Write a protein that binds this ligand. Structure first.
Ligand SMILES: Cn1cnn(Cc2ccc(F)c(Cl)c2)c1=O
Lengths: 300, 237
């Protein structure tokens, strides 16, 4: 179990750690989060009391270094940093732990929610979507735009998701115009899976990472990427049976976890009704369809 | 964006453009089978592609052989239309290619966009206008060449005959649409009007009679009455 210690908490902030969150008052005695499960990526995120605008945060894996949070009063945010002096980190962490100034990552032992939301998400891939190679952790916020969004302005602060575009020469073989547009299997299996992602795990990892940036930061561009990658599979007549079964599990847990009162904005009516009720895979997402129909039957 | 009442005059500027109408591509007769079921028999169709400034009509005949062994024919008809339009554009020298294609039905937008990915500089546009191009098969000579075709074929017409020698393209387009609106609302009357003169002639190389300026006013007036009339007989007004 690992620890993200905090130097202090000078401004009132709502802190999120994975799917959990808690309030810290201005100058409350708070020195971070302990007992974080090793083996998964994590995200620690922030919403200032005074400006619910801008939710920002950091994707990290404790196996890749010792990380801590200290507020920067010049740039005005809680910044993630790496302590390279391991002994000092241990002395500092042990001191905060003995004074019981840390909250405990509150994992119920029955609960596989976080694993299920991040099963294919790997920090090395996140760092290729979020380019900032001098840090081992990756910052994301509400306003960051995607590479595709910039095609339609600062490239260094962009989310370099894989560009999917159903009306593109990439997606459409000459002389298969109708075939390739109504049945995207070529674009899924050959262009994207075999060509770009190499395997379905990397595909699912980007898909899960897009959803999570949507949910935790309201990063519109991620929301668009998530739906696009769902729709590409659903609109493909030929999908490996294992990918379909895995996709059903993936989406089930995404829909299960989504805050009920965010479903209006996040969830795209056209994509879901198409995927569940018109597409080739309309019969292949039993779990996802059952939870969607019992939880958000308005949307359908 | 969409072509409508408010940007109507754009059709007659000097940017090459085409209307594409697909309403007559997939045509069928519905009939009873020996067992008392219903079946369809395809008959030849056409794509109506029209330059509204010049009146050049690129009438691609869709022969029934193109449907053989195919499923979902109404959907294929839209892609087949898109395929033939994009072949036409590819056959033209760059400086003759349209800058815009305007489709009369929104369901053509995705099929044409996809077939035209190689031409990102050609705007594919819908319209809010209820244009009467479906009545193009009420023009006898057009209907005749379509029904007689035994293979795929492109036939070229000027749908304005020689009108542009005397009137502007705006006024020729407006006459065309009146004539076709009339033909669509009551083909028999419409044709009775046009062919009401036993002494008037349609030239071998034309589609419509050789009316004088004054005779066209009379004709155009009679076609307006028809459209108002049938609007009564259909609405009891
Ligand atoms: C005590 N002091 C305050 N700041 N620094 C660095 C630092 C601080 C807090 C921490 F949570 C970690 Cl890991 C590292 C320090 O040495």
């Amino acid at each position: 179990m690992n620890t993200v210690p905090f130097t202090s908490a000078p401004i009132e902030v709502t802190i999120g750690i994975d799917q959990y969150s808690f309030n810290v008052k201005e100058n409350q005695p708070f020195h971070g989060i302990k007992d974080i499960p090793i083996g998964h990526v994590h995200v620690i995120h922030f919403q200032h009391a005074d400006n619910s605008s801008m939710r920002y945060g950091y994707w990290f894996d404790c196996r890749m270094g010792n990380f801590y949070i200290q507020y920067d009063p010049k740039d005005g945010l809680y910044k993630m940093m790496e302590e390279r002096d391991g002994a000092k980190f241990e002395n500092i962490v042990h001191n905060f732990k003995e004074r019981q100034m840390m909250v405990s990552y509150p994992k119920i032992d029955e609960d596989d929610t976080w694993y299920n939301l991040t099963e294919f998400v790997q920090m090395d891939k996140i760092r290729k979507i979020v380019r900032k190679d001098e840090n081992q952790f990756s910052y994301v916020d509400s306003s960051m735009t995607t590479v595709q969004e910039n095609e339609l302005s600062d490239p260094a602060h962009s989310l370099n998701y894989t560009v999917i575009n159903f009306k593109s020469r990439e997606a459409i073989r000459p002389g298969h115009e109708m075939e390739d547009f109504l049945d995207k299997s070529y674009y899924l299996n050959t262009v994207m899976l075999q060509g770009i992602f190499k395997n379905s795990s990397n595909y699912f990892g980007e898909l899960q990472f897009a959803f999570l940036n949507a949910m935790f930061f309201g990063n519109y561009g991620s929301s668009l990427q998530w739906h696009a990658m769902i729709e590409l599979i659903c609109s493909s007549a030929t999908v490996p049976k294992h990918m379909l079964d895995k996709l059903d599990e993936i989406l089930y847990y995404q829909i299960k976890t989504l805050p009920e009162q965010y479903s209006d904005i996040l969830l795209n009516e056209r994509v879901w009704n198409i995927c569940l009720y018109s597409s080739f895979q309309k019969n292949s997402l039993h779990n996802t369809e059952k939870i969607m129909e019992n939880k958000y039957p308005e949307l359908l | 964006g969409a072509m409508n009442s408010s940007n109507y005059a754009e059709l007659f500027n000097n940017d090459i453009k085409l209307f594409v109408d697909d309403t007559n591509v997939y045509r069928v007769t519905v009939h009873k089978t020996f067992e008392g079921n219903v079946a369809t028999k395809a008959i030849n169709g056409c794509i109506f592609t029209l330059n509204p400034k010049t009146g050049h009509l690129f009438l691609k005949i869709i022969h029934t052989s193109v449907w053989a062994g195919q499923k979902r024919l109404s959907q294929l008809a839209k892609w087949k239309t898109a395929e033939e339009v994009s072949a036409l554009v590819r056959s033209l020298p760059k400086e003759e290619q349209p800058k815009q294609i305007i489709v009369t039905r929104k369901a053509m937008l995705d099929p044409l966009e996809v077939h035209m990915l190689d031409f990102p500089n050609i705007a594919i546009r819908p319209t809010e206008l209820r244009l009467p191009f479906s009545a193009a098969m009420s023009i006898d000579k057009l209907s005749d060449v379509v029904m007689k075709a035994t293979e795929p074929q492109m036939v070229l017409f000027n749908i304005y005959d020689d009108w542009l020698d005397r009137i502007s393209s705006y006024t020729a387009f407006s006459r065309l649409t009146l004539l076709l609106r009339a033909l669509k609302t009551n083909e028999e009357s419409a044709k009775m009007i046009l062919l009401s003169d036993p002494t008037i002639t349609i030239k071998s190389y034309h589609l419509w009679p050789s009316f004088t300026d004054e005779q066209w006013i009379t004709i155009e007036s009679q076609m307006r009455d028809l459209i108002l009339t049938e609007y009564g007989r259909k609405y009891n007004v």
